[PDB]
Amino acid sequence: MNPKRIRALKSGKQGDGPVVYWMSRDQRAEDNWALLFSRAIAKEANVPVVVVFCLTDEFLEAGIRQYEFMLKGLQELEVSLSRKKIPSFFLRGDPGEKISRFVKDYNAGTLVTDFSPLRIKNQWIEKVISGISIPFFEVDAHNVVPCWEASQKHEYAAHTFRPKLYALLPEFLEEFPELEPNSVTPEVETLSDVLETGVKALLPERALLKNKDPLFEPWHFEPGEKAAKKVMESFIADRLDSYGALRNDPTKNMLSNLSPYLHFGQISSQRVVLEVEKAESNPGSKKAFLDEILIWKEISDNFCYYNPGYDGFESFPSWAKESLNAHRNDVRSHIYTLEEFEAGKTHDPLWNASQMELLSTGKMHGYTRMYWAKKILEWSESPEKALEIAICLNDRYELDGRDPNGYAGIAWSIGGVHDRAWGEREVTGKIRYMSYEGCKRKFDVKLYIEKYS
Numbered sequence: 198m199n200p201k202r203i204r205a206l207k208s209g210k211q212g213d214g215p216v217v218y219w220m221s222r223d224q225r226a227e228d229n230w231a232l233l234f235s236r237a238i239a240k241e242a243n244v245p246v247v248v249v250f251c252l253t254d255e256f257l258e259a260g261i262r263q264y265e266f267m268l269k270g271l272q273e274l275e276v277s278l279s280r281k282k283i284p285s286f287f288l289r290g291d292p293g294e295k296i297s298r299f300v301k302d303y304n305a306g307t308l309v310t311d312f313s314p315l316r317i318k319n320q321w322i323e324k325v326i327s328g329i330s331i332p333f334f335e336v337d338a339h340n341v342v343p344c345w346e347a348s349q350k351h352e353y354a355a356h357t358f359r360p361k362l363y364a365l366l367p368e369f370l371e372e373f374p375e376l377e378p379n380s381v382t383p384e385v386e387t388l389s390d391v392l393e394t395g396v397k398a399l400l401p402e403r404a405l406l407k408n409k410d411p412l413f414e415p416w417h418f419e420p421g422e423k424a425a426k427k428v429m430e431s432f433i434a435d436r437l438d439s440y441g442a443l444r445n446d447p448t449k450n451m452l453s454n455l456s457p458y459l460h461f462g463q464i465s466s467q468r469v470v471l472e473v474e475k476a477e478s479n480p481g482s483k484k485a486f487l488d489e490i491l492i493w494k495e496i497s498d499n500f501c502y503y504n505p506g507y508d509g510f511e512s513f514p515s516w517a518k519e520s521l522n523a524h525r526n527d528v529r530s531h532i533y534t535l536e537e538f539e540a541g542k543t544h545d546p547l548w549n550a551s552q553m554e555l556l557s558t559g560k561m562h563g564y565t566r567m568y569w570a571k572k573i574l575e576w577s578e579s580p581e582k583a584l585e586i587a588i589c590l591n592d593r594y595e596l597d598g599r600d601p602n603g604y605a606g607i608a609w610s611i612g613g614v615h616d617r618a619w620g621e622r623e624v625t626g627k628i629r630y631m632s633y634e635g636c637k638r639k640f641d642v643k644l645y646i647e648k649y650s
């Protein structure tokens with residue numbers, strides 16, 4: 198176990214009670230460095246490990262599609278941890294109040310959590326630190342190379358982050374040790390009841406069409422650790438060979454469809470990389486897929502960790518901020534409100550089709566996501582308004598939303614983060630432009646539009 202994966206958030210006097218793993222981002226029992234590190238510290242102090250998950254007050258800012266996908270995975274996860282004799286405790290409320298109360302009530306010895314560079318997780322960490330006196334650690338269980346180890350600063354391009362990450366792959370890309378069970382079982386409600394009351398609170402804001410029928414289709418992605426491994430296995434056996442050639446075709450289901458599991462932490466990216474690396478397939482397709490799950494996925498964490506305003510106009514590159522400012526007063530071709538963007542009521546059928554796929558499946562195709570966000574910038578009153586509209590629609594309806602990938606993806610599409618300057622245009626400036634005619638020359642746009650009416 199590499200000690201570079203764990204960081205100390207607060208020193209203190211160790212108690213003699215169970216080591217608490219405050220699971221937030223990596224919701225799985227297998228291939229979890231944070232859970233393995235908690236078990237090892239628990240073994241060293243002769244004390245069992247315990248698992249605590251907080252059901253926060255911010256679930257109403259999202260939809261039923263993410264609430265059910267997350268909770269249905271936790272229901273499977275509770276069974277899996279119980280078989281290895283680790284108990285799980287699900288608290289409802291503020292992590293700053295619930296974690297501090299749980300630590301004091303249960304005489305917790307050491308507190309451990311997983312790593313997340315999002316602002317809301319840092320808000321919880323500040324509150325928890327102020328109310329505990331035991332040691333507090335955090336472990337990077339989401340990235341193959343720890344976020345603080347891959348780079349010590351913000352990387353302005355993938356070609357500058359790629360050699361750094363690949364040089365540390367031989368050290369950090371390793372097999373996971375088996376999660377040992379607790380020696381004996383140690384000494385706040387049923388998740389089914391919490392899911393029932395939560396869904397009832399989210400029903401009035403459900404995404405419906407004119408016929409009052411729900412718009413979301415929940416049969417596209419089954420949640421759970423077991424389902425994530427089946428989707429991963431299918432991708433390697435059926436879709437990895439053709440990934441490098443058809444990853445930009447939204448009319449083909451050639452993507453891995455691993456993002457909803459990767460976002461909630463139901464499957465480890467390191468596990469996916471290990472299986473992909475030992476598979477035999479198209480080397481161009483393997484290189485393309487590893488470039489997406491290693492470089493671009495972990496550079497998103499690098500973006501949010503080293504840019505406090507990762508969701509603001511200030512984090513854009515200087516060339517993009519100057520270009521967008523020089524085109525602020527340019528007359529936009531069209532101006533759509535948030536409701537018009539949300540309902541897919543724009544003049545562009547391709548954009549509307551992309552929005553319908555987001556509304557119905559909860560997972561828009563990777564290529565159309567770039568077109569979807571770049572057209573928001575073209576049809577907004579300001580780049581700051583486009584950032585708000587893109588982030589709102591992304592986090593509300595994407596099953597993988599509220600993720601560092603989305604904010605880094607949105608920053609690339611609108612602010613040119615991790616991109617270069619292109620030909621200068623009106624309104625958009627030097628930001629990379631994607632036209633409707635360009636998409637038609639790339640794939641069958643008519644089929645994609647007809648699929649999502």
Ligand SMILES: Cc1cc2nc3c(=O)[nH]c(=O)nc-3n(C[C@H](O)[C@H](O)[C@H](O)COP(=O)(O)OP(=O)(O)OC[C@H]3O[C@@H](n4cnc5c(N)ncnc54)[C@H](O)[C@@H]3O)c2cc1C
Nearest residue numbers: 452453454455456489490494563566570597598602603606
């Ligand atoms: C405007 C916009 C919004 C996005 N919103 C999200 C989002 O809300 N949540 C999210 O997790 N990703 C988002 N992405 C990144 C990307 O679109 C998705 O990760 C990808 O489409 C998810 O489907 P997939 O797993 O089948 O892709 P695959 O091609 O099968 O790649 C597998 C994994 O590689 C990673 N990956 C692939 N492409 C990217 C990328 N461009 N950036 C970062 N990581 C990537 C993902 O973790 C992905 O799960 C967004 C990108 C853009 C341009």
